[PDB]
Every structure is written in structure tokens, then in C-alpha cells.
Amino acid sequence: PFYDSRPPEGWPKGSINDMDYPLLGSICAVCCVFVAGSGIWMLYRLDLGMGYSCKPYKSGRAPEVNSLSGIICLLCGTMYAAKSFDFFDGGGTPFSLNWYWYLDYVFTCPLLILDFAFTLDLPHKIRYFFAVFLTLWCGVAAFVTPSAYRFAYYALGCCWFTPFALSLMRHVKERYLVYPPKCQRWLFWACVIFFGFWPMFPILFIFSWLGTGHISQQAFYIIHAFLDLTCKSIFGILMTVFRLELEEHTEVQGLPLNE
Amino acid sequence: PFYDSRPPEGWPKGSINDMDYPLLGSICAVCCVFVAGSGIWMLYRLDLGMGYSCKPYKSGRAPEVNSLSGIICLLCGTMYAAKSFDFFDGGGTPFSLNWYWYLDYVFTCPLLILDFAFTLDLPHKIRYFFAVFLTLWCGVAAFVTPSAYRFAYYALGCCWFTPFALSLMRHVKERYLVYPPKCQRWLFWACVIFFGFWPMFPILFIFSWLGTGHISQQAFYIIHAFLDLTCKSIFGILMTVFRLELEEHTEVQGLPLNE
Amino acid sequence: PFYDSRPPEGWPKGSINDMDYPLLGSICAVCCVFVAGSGIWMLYRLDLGMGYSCKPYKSGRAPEVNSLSGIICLLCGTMYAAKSFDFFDGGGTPFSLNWYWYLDYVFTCPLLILDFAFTLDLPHKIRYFFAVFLTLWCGVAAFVTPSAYRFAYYALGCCWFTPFALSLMRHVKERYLVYPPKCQRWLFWACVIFFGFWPMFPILFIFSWLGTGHISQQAFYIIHAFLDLTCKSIFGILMTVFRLELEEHTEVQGLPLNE
Numbered sequence: 040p041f042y043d044s045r046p047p048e049g050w051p052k053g054s055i056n057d058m059d060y061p062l063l064g065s066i067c068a069v070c071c072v073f074v075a076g077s078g079i080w081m082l083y084r085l086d087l088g089m090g091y092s093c094k095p096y097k098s099g100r101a102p103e104v105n106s107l108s109g110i111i112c113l114l115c116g117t118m119y120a121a122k123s124f125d126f127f128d129g130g131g132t133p134f135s136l137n138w139y140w141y142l143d144y145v146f147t148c149p150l151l152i153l154d155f156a157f158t159l160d161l162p163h164k165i166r167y168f169f170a171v172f173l174t175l176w177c178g179v180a181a182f183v184t185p186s187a188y189r190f191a192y193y194a195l196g197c198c199w200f201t202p203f204a205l206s207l208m209r210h211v212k213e214r215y216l217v218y219p220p221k222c223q224r225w226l227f228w229a230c231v232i233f234f235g236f237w238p239m240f241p242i243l244f245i246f247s248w249l250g251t252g253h254i255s256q257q258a259f260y261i262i263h264a265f266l267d268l269t270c271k272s273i274f275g276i277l278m279t280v281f282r283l284e285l286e287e288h289t290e291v292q293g294l295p296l297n298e
Numbered sequence: 299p300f301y302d303s304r305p306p307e308g309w310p311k312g313s314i315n316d317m318d319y320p321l322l323g324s325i326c327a328v329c330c331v332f333v334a335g336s337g338i339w340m341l342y343r344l345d346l347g348m349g350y351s352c353k354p355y356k357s358g359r360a361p362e363v364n365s366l367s368g369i370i371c372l373l374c375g376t377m378y379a380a381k382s383f384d385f386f387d388g389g390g391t392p393f394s395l396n397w398y399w400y401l402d403y404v405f406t407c408p409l410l411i412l413d414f415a416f417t418l419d420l421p422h423k424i425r426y427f428f429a430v431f432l433t434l435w436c437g438v439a440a441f442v443t444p445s446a447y448r449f450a451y452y453a454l455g456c457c458w459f460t461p462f463a464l465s466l467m468r469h470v471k472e473r474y475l476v477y478p479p480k481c482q483r484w485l486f487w488a489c490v491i492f493f494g495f496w497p498m499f500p501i502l503f504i505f506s507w508l509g510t511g512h513i514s515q516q517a518f519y520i521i522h523a524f525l526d527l528t529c530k531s532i533f534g535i536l537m538t539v540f541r542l543e544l545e546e547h548t549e550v551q552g553l554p555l556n557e
Numbered sequence: 558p559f560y561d562s563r564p565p566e567g568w569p570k571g572s573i574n575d576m577d578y579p580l581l582g583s584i585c586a587v588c589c590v591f592v593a594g595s596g597i598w599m600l601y602r603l604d605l606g607m608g609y610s611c612k613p614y615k616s617g618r619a620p621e622v623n624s625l626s627g628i629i630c631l632l633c634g635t636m637y638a639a640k641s642f643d644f645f646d647g648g649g650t651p652f653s654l655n656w657y658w659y660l661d662y663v664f665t666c667p668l669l670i671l672d673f674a675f676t677l678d679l680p681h682k683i684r685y686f687f688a689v690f691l692t693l694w695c696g697v698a699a700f701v702t703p704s705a706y707r708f709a710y711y712a713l714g715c716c717w718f719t720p721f722a723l724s725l726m727r728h729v730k731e732r733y734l735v736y737p738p739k740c741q742r743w744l745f746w747a748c749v750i751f752f753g754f755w756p757m758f759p760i761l762f763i764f765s766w767l768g769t770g771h772i773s774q775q776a777f778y779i780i781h782a783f784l785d786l787t788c789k790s791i792f793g794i795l796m797t798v799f800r801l802e803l804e805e806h807t808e809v810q811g812l813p814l815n816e
């Protein structure tokens with residue numbers, strides 16, 4: 040979708056693309072390594088077996104949806120490797136995963152909510168998937184729109200995230216009482232990460248360079264690198280641990296849920 | 299995928315983009331509101347229960363594929379909100395869902411045929427999905443190609459829609475005798491909308507500005523807004539009512555199908 | 558995603574796009590016809606019945622995943638029809654499926670590995686799908702990157718294909734002993750095509766115009782046309798024949814597998 044490119048003399052001084060590119064490339068490389076390693080660990084732990092006792096799967100293989108967390112983390116890590124390649128080249132690279140904001144998210148976050156719904160057996164998985172998909176596409180549209188109508192696109196996204204976040208929460212509550220306290224301990228932190236950091240993105244939009252202008256694009260890249268390290272890597276680790284505790288309770292010990 | 303933009307002095311007079319943009323923006327906003335409200339109603343009615351008696355679901359949740367109609371309608375409504383944003387900005391907006399014809403359809407219509415197949419238990423759901431996908435991509439290619447080879451792409455699309463429409467019809471007939479007359483009443487109008495309005499798009503191509511030149515791009519936008527009002531909103535409402543009648547016959551009353 | 562176009566005077570002499578376009582268009586048309594016909598034959602044979610005796614399906618329809626091979630072949634054939642349209646127009650066509658290398662593959666090869674996993678009941682189908690997806694996107698990034706960092710993207714792809722190919726092979730071996738010798742005969746040639754021709758693409762990258770410079774873009778197009786003739790058409794035919802033999806062994810004759 041690219042039309043712009045880095046000028047032969049470099050990015051104009053004072054522009055939003057006049058950024059510390061070696062630093063952002065190093066940060067993206069570190070994030071890539073961490074998130075890819077976390078996803079590899081989640082996949083390996085899932086293949087180890089059910090629960091903390093590593094009870095072998097009856098079919099000999101893990102459920103396919105259970106590998107969503109590791110796949111999302113590895114995909115995010117490879118996206119961050121591409122981002123580091125783009126940043127180390129000075130930005131404006133033909134295959135830039137940094138240029139179009141939230142364009143890389145339309146692959147990870149719908150999958151992330153799908154994994155969250157599959158782990159918690161949340162209803163309307165397709166509805167949540169498409170809600171997150173449309174919210175992220177509204178964000179991409181707002182970030183590529185140079186006029187005031189971007190705040191319309193933002194608002195359109197806010198017309199999707201506000202109900203979805205209000206719906207999911209309620210549904211999550213209906214599941215929260217079902218699970219044992221040991222699994223509830225990890226579910227609490229997964230929900231904290233979700234309902235605390237997902238709302239951060241729309242708030243960070245307001246104070247970005249296309250909002251009040253308080254956060255620059257470089258600071259935006261750093262903040263979103265930390266957010267992806269939290270929203271994908273740490274959230275996936277917490278989902279893996281919650282799944283291990285649930286399998287230990289229900290499959291290893293044979294105990295029923297509080298439903 | 300964008301390269302062109304609205305010239306600083308505006309669209310050249312007499313060009314295909316010299317269009318009544320406030321009117322098209324208002325039409326797109328009205329279509330967005332109507333289709334999004336219809337999709338919200340479909341999802342709410344699906345969550346109400348099975349059939350006209352609103353019999354509660356045994357699992358407590360509706361089937362995931364049953365929410366396809368409302369999801370398609372909400373996605374189309376948000377696409378039309380984006381279209382109204384693009385039109386009210388004067389067109390040629392970086393995130394324009396109006397520029398590339400049938401590009402927005404590659405998300406709605408494959409899902410639409412998937413929903414139709416799931417509701418009627420039609421065979422080869424993946425085959426129909428990919429047939430519609432390839433037909434719409436051939437249409438996008440024909441609309442972005444400025445040479446005569448666009449009529450090749452159009453022909454390629456006609457090499458996909460003609461068999462598919464001839465196949466689906468036959469398969470639909472095999473299902474039409476299965477359902478009771480009350481459900482057949484809604485199935486008749488759903489099939490009327492399908493086999494009447496889906497062929498309209500290739501016919502409208504012939505008389506468009508890249509065909510015979512009788513229908514301008516503004517008139518094309520209005521006609522396709524009405525078509526999406528019929529093909530997505532009304533067709534989804536008819537699918538919801540047919541599903542309600544089928545659930546009343548088979549689940550509420552326990553009566554069997556005529557198979 | 559297009560920004561470049563064929564210059565009004567034509568492609569500059571000596572450039573990578575100064576190619577024999579009538580010849581490439583004819584080759585692409587022949588490949589389109591062959592692959593589309595092969596996919597049509599696979600779908601028709603699948604609809605005929607299970608095994609060589611054409612035992613009717615109990616549900617009256619073939620499994621949906623069983624039609625993946627024919628769908629992939631038909632999609633590749635239509636992509637090659639579009640490629641022939643682009644080449645016959647002189648290249649640089651707005652909807653060019655030839656410009657961005659491996660961009661058309663991100664639709665066929667993830668589906669190809671999905672079909673291979675479904676036919677052989679290979680574990681971690683989603684993992685293999687996403688591994689191939691990310692490998693192909695790394696290839697697209699390497700082919701659109703003009704700097705040395707393309708060899709980074711290539712390396713990133715080599716960081717995905719090398720484990721996946723090493724994993725799938727092992728998993729394939731676990732399935733190879735399960736199947737009878739008659740099905741093993743077709744599985745051997747399917748695995749030969751896979752593990753011989755899939756590694757060819759990264760090797761062909763090294764000697765292409767963005768590598769050592771020994772293979773031109775025209776020769777690359779011809780070689781990849783033959784590869785798609787082998788990797789999609791012949792591999793799909795071998796999958797269809799292996800499925801027929803497996804259904805004859807297990808469904809027609811009722812014999813069990815060697816598991």
C-alpha cells in the first residue's frame with residue numbers, strides 16, 4: 040500500500056519520521072527476541088502435556104486452538120524482526136511494518152481475542168473476532184487519514200471497542216466464578232492486562248501527534264513495543280499458565296468446575 | 299494500495315470523480331445506519347432464542363455460524379460509515395473504501411455465501427466461498443485495469459459466477475423441497491434476492507463508465523448502495539426470519555423436515 | 558500496493574522488466590489451463606465417491622477439507638490467468654500478480670500445507686499453516702526490499718522454513734508407516750515433490766537477480782511456472798490419488814491402518 044519513501048537526503052528535520060532509528064531498531068530486535076522466545080516456550084509447554092504434571096494427551100497431540108497463544112507470540116516476534124529491519128534501514132522501507140499503525144495488529148489482536156475466547160469458552164467467538172478486526176481497521180484508517188475525519192474513524196473504532204469491552208468483561212465475569220481460585224489467580228492478571236492495556240491504545244491516540252501532539256512517533260513506537268510485550272507476550276504466558284492450572288484441576292485431578 | 303489522490307484544486311471537471319460528494323456521503327451514512335441497525339437486530343433476535351417462541355438454547359448460546367448474517371450486516375454498515383467519511387472528505391481519501399470497486403465486497407459476499415450455505419446446509423461450502431472470493435477479485439482487477447484486458451478479467455469473473463450461480467441454484471432447489479412451506483415462503487424471497495440481484499452486478503458493469511458508458515460512477519455508487527441495502531440487509535433479514543421459522547418447526551414443535 | 562507502472566515508451570532496455578512478454582503470457586496461459594483443468598478433475602473425482610470403486614458418501618457429499626486440493630489448483634489457475642493478462646499487457650499492470658514475488662503464494666501454499674496436513678492427519682495444522690504463511694511473507698518482504706536487508710528477510714524466512722521442513726518431515730515419517738504400501742507409493746512421490754521442490758525456492762532466490770544474478774526475472778517466471786505446475790497441480794493429483802487409495806483400503810474394503 041506504500042507510496043511514500045525516505046527522501047534521498049533523509050527524513051526532513053522536525054518531521055514525525057525524524058526519529059532515533061538505531062535505538063528503535065534495537066528495541067524492536069529485543070522485543071522480537073523476547074516475544075518469539077515466549078511463543079516458542081508456550082508451544083513447547085503445550086506440547087509437553089496437560090497440566091503441571093504433563094499428563095500425555097489421549098490423542099497424542101494438543102488441541103489446535105490451544106496453540107493460538109504461541110502462534111500469536113511468534114507472529115508478533117517476526118513482525119518485530121521485520122520492524123527492526125525497517126528501522127535499521129532508516130524507515131520508509133517498502134515492506135515497512137512500522138509505517139501503517141495498527142496494520143500489524145489486525146493479524147495479532149483478532150487472533151488474541153479468539154485465543155482468549157477459546158481458553159475461557161466465551162460465547163460469540165466470531166462476534167468478538169470481527170469486533171476487534173473492525174476496531175483495528177478503524178484505527179488504521181484514522182492513522183492514515185490526514186484530515187479531521189480521522190477523528191471520525193477513531194470514533195468509529197470507539198463505537199466498536201466500547202461495546203465489545205463492555206460485553207467481553209460481562210461475559211468474562213460469568214466465566215470467572217466458574218474456575219477454581221488457583222486458575223482464577225491467573226485469570227485475574229490476564230483480565231487486568233486486557234482491561235487495562237487494551238483501553239490504553241485509544242487513550243494514547245488522543246495524545247499522539249495526530250491528537251494533542253504530546254507523544255511523538257518515536258515515543259509511540261517505544262510505548263507500543265512495551266504494550267505488545269505486555270499484551271501479547273505476558274498475556275500469552277498468563278493464558279498458558281491458566282490453561283495448565285485448568286488442565287491440572289480438571290484433567291489431572293478429575294475435579295469438576297464450579298458451574 | 300493507493301497511489302492517486304484528489305488534486306489540490308479538486309477533481310478535474312468532467313472526470314469520473316467529479317461527483318456529488320455531499321449527496322453520496324449522505325446516502326452512504328443512511329445506508330450505514332440502516333444496515334448496522336439491521337445487523338444489530340439480527341444479532342439481538344438470534345440471542346433471544348430459537349424460533350418465534352424464543353426457546354432458550356440448550357447450551358445457553360446461539361450457534362456461532364448463525365451470527366454470520368448480523369456480522370456481515372454490521373461489517374457492511376461500518377464499511378459504509380467509512381465510505382461516507384471518504385465521500386464527505388471529497389473522495390480520494392487515503393483509506394477510501396469507495397475507490398477500488400468490489401474491494402469491500404471480497405469481505406462481505408464470501409461471508410454472505412458462507413452464511414447462505416450454513417443456513418441451508420448446502421454442500422461444498424468452501425467451494426462456494428472460494429468461487430465468490432475469486433469472482434470478486436476478478437471484478438476488482440477489471441475495475442483497476444485501464445486497458446481492454448479488464449474485459450478479460452470481467453470474463454474471468456464471468457467464468458466463475460456463471461457456474462457457481464448455476465450450481466448453487468440447483469443445490470438450493472434440492473434444499474427447497476426439504477423445508478416446510480412456511481420456511482419456503484422466506485426461502486423463495488431470499489432466492490429471489492440472490493438470483494436476481496447478484497447477476498445485476500456483472501450486467502451493471504457492462505453499462506458502467508468502463509463498459510458502454512451509460513451509468514456514471516455517481517449513479518454506480520447509488521445503485522450499489524441500494525444493492526447492498528437489498529443484498530446484505532434485506533437478505534440477512536430474510537435469512538433470520540427463515541431461521542426463526544425453521545427453528546419453530548424443528549426445535550420448538552419438534553416436527554421433522556420433508557427429507 | 559502498486560506505485561510503479563510501465564513507462565509510456567516501455568520498460569527500459571536492460572532492466573529486469575525488459576522481458577519476453579508474449580512468451581511469458583503464453584506460458585502463463587498454458588499453466589492456467591493445465592492447473593485449472595487439474596483442479597476441476599480433482600473436484601469432479603472427489604464428488605464421484607470414495608476410493609477407486611466410487612463408493613457413495615454416506616452423507617451424500619464429500620468432506621469439505623477434501624476439496625482443498627482442487628480449490629488450490631483452481632485458485633492457482635485463475636492467478637495464472639491474471640498473470641497471463643498482465644504479461645500480455647506488457648507488465649506493470651495495476652492488478653499485476655507477477656510484480657510482487659510470492660504474494661500470490663501466500664494464498665496457495667498455506668492452503669497447500671493445510672491440505673497436506675488434513676490428508677495425512679498431521680498434528681499442529683494451524684502451526685504449519687502459520688509457518689508457511691510467515692515464510693511466504695518474509696519472501697515477499699525480501700523481494701520488495703531493495704537494500705541488503707532483504708537478505709535479512711530471506712534469512713528470517715530461512716528461520717521459518719528450516720524448522721518447519723525439519724518438523725513436517727519427521728511428522729510425515731510418523732504417518733508414512735501408518736499407511737498401506739499402495740498408499741505409500743503415492744505418499745512417496747508427494748513427499749518427493751514437497752521436500753525436493755519447496756527447498757528449491759530459497760535456493761533459486763540466491764541465484765536470482767537480487768542474489769548472485771545468474772537467473773533473470775524472465776527465467777525466474779518460467780521456472781516458477783514449472784514449479785507451480787509441479788508443486789500445485791502434480792502434488793494435488795498425487796494427493797487425490799493417495800486419498801482414493803486410502804478410501805479404497807479403509808472405506809471400500811474396510812481394512813484397518815497399520816497404526
Ligand SMILES: *C/C=C(C)/C=C/C=C(C)/C=C/C1=C(C)CCCC1(C)C
Nearest residue numbers: 178193196197200237240241267270
Ligand atoms: C498487542 C496489541 C494489541 C492488544 C492491540 C490492541 C488494540 C486496540 C485495543 C485498539 C484500539 C483502537 C480503538 C479503540 C479505536 C481507535 C483506534 C485504536 C486502534 C487506537
Ligand SMILES: *C/C=C(C)/C=C/C=C(C)/C=C/C1=C(C)CCCC1(C)C
Nearest residue numbers: 437452455456459496499500526529
Ligand atoms: C452486497 C454485495 C454483493 C452481493 C455483491 C455481489 C457481487 C457479485 C455477484 C459480483 C459480480 C461480478 C462478476 C460476476 C464478474 C465481473 C465483475 C463483478 C464484480 C461485477
Ligand SMILES: *C/C=C(C)/C=C/C=C(C)/C=C/C1=C(C)CCCC1(C)C
Nearest residue numbers: 696711714715718755758759785788
Ligand atoms: C506453488 C508454490 C509453492 C509450493 C511455494 C513455496 C514457497 C516456499 C517454500 C518459500 C520459500 C522461501 C523461503 C524459504 C524463505 C526465503 C523466501 C522464499 C519465498 C524463497
Ligand SMILES: [K+]
Nearest residue numbers: 104105157158
Ligand atoms: K485454548
Ligand SMILES: [K+]
Nearest residue numbers: 105106108109
Ligand atoms: K499456546
Ligand SMILES: [K+]
Nearest residue numbers: 135136137139
Ligand atoms: K505496516
Ligand SMILES: [K+]
Nearest residue numbers: 136137139140
Ligand atoms: K506501526
Ligand SMILES: [K+]
Nearest residue numbers: 137138139140
Ligand atoms: K507513519
Ligand SMILES: [K+]
Nearest residue numbers: 363364416417
Ligand atoms: K446459520
Ligand SMILES: [K+]
Nearest residue numbers: 364365367368
Ligand atoms: K444473524
Ligand SMILES: [K+]
Nearest residue numbers: 394395396398
Ligand atoms: K476501497
Ligand SMILES: [K+]
Nearest residue numbers: 395396398399
Ligand atoms: K466502491
Ligand SMILES: [K+]
Nearest residue numbers: 396397398399
Ligand atoms: K474509482
Ligand SMILES: [K+]
Nearest residue numbers: 622623675676
Ligand atoms: K483431505
Ligand SMILES: [K+]
Nearest residue numbers: 623624626627
Ligand atoms: K480435491
Ligand SMILES: [K+]
Nearest residue numbers: 653654655657
Ligand atoms: K502481485
